[PDB]
Amino acid sequence: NSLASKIMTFCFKVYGATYLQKLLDPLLRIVITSSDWQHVSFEVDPTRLEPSESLEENQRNLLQMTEKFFHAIISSSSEFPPQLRSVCHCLYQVVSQRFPQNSIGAVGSAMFLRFINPAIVSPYEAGILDKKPPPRIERGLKLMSKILQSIANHVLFTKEEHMRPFNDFVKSNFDAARRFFLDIASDLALHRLLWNNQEKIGQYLRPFDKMATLLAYLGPP
Amino acid sequence: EQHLMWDDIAILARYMLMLSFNNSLDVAAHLPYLFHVVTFLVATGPLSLRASTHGLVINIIHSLCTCSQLHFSEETKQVLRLSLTEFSLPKFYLLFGISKVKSAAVIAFYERETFALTSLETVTEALLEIMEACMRDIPTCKWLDQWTELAQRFAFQYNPSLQPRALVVFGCISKRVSHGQIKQIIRILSKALESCLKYNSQVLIEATVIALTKLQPLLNKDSPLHKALFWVAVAVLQLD
């Protein structure tokens, strides 16, 4: 988390809120209102698994939910708002000056890590839902975002042994997300903030001096 | 301050402060001549005269923001408003040889900072940015040309007290220069170094070198003098 990292997440926030909200809310309501009928469980950690539930069955439940969630994101190119498409392309070109090889990967990871996945894990706090989903859904959404991040980072699971069974799923969807990233990446009391940090703006190495006066006239009122 | 006519100048500077608020009616014919007076006076003499001379500039800038005869743009007016703000800063107090005071006004109505020409350079470019901003809006004026002539006259003529100040100003304000003017400046530098064989001389050397600094961006692209001035600088550094 640096200032430029804050700037990027802010642009995703103020421009993609309506984008995420209308994209994830239908799938979430299908996961809660529907499929609450059965004992849907996404628990794939064996040491955490109840004796009554089945590992093979829960593993399928996770991949099905992850599949339609991933499909809805990849197929959402025609609904991507233009302000972000400008942010990701601006991010695409600047890194390409120093890392021209696979520079598109950095855009897609930050896209999923700082924008898509945090709203998937916590839909209520992101403003997408009216209340938190049931506890069994919250465990599945957290596990799904771990899979979706592996796809975005183009890296297999190598840490937790219970996420390796999904490596075949993430290895196949590598380039589908890579195509989606290549798509979206191609085309106030300010004076109160100014004067509070105005002290010694001229520490550099004309405009900083000029600026100190406007800060002293506007801010001190 | 020693000069045979110092009192006569000091008196007129006093009048000029009082007049300067009424100069809100006056400035349009005068503005160059007032900065010519500022240029010589800017930090000189007893502290009350310095305070007066700071006030003189403040009041002139304010007068340029409101003369009912003028029609400056919102950009030009904003530049002047920000200039008033800038001249009100402690930085400009030190430039005018004011230190140890809350308000220049109070003292206006010695601990000479032994005058640093770099301070006059700073003032002069600020007054130049004021004049330039205005001159865009008033195409029918001759102000900078008259200031150039007035400063030029005093820069080139022999007068140990004023000539350094004038050279600094001439250099700062000018928009063109000739090899014959540079010859006169470097001849002044040389004559000032002869006088060092025989403080005032040193201030004249500093002035000529500052003048050469401002003047050298003006010189013609194929002039030898750009290369020559590097050695003028080297020789100056050698002085210690």
Measured distance CA(B111)–CA(B40) in Å, rounded: 18
* Cα dist from A19 to A16, A31, A177, A193, B180, whole Å: 5, 19, 18, 31, 71
Q: Is B42 helix (H, G, I), strand (E, B) or coil?
A: coil
Q: How was this structure determined?
A: cryo-EM
Q: Which two tokens mark B71?
A: 């029609």
Q: Report the Cα B212 to chain-centroid distance in Å.
A: 15
CA distance A96 to chain B (A): 39
A218 touches chain B (CB under 8 A): no
Q: Are residues B82 and A209, on separate chains, in Cβ contact within 8 Å?
A: no
Secondary structure percentages of chain B, helix, strand, coil, to 5? 70, 0, 30
Q: Which residues of B touch A (CB under 8 A)?
A: 82, 85-86, 89, 91
CB atoms inside a 10 Å sphere around CB B26: 17
Q: Which two tokens mark B181?
A: 């003017």
For B4-142, where are the alpha helices, taking DSSP H only?
Answer: 6-26, 31-41, 47-65, 74-87, 90-95, 104-108, 117-137
For residue A210, give the chain B residue with the closest CA. Answer: B86
Q: Please enumerate in sequence order all residues whose Cβ is within 8 A of that of A197, keeping only pairs 6 or more positions apart, or say none.
A: none
Taking a C-beta distance cutoff of 8 angstroms, is the pair B93, B47 a contact? no
From the candidates B79, B81, B83, B89, which should be mutated to test the interface with A, based on the most A CB atoms within 10 A?
Answer: B89
Query: In units of Å, what resolution does this entry have?
Result: 5.6
Taking a C-beta distance cutoff of 8 angstroms, is the pair A143, A160 a contact? no
Taking a C-beta distance cutoff of 8 angstroms, is the pair A169, A63 a contact? yes
Taking a C-beta distance cutoff of 8 angstroms, is the pair A177, A108 a contact? yes
For residue B85, give the chain A residue with the closest CA. Answer: A213
Q: Which two tokens mark B64?
A: 């340029």
Q: Which two tokens mark B36?
A: 């010519």
Look up residue A102 and give its DSSP letter: T
A200 touches chain B (CB under 8 A): no
Q: Angle formed by the axes of helices B117-137 and B163-173, to 10°?
A: 40
Look up residue A54 and give its DSSP letter: -
CB atoms inside a 10 Å sphere around CB A184: 21
For residue A218, give the chain B residue with the closest CA. Answer: B85
Taking a C-beta distance cutoff of 8 angstroms, is the pair A53, A32 a contact? no
Q: Are residues B85 and A217, on separate chains, in Cβ contact within 8 Å?
A: yes
Q: Are residues B89 and A217, on separate chains, in Cβ contact within 8 Å?
A: no
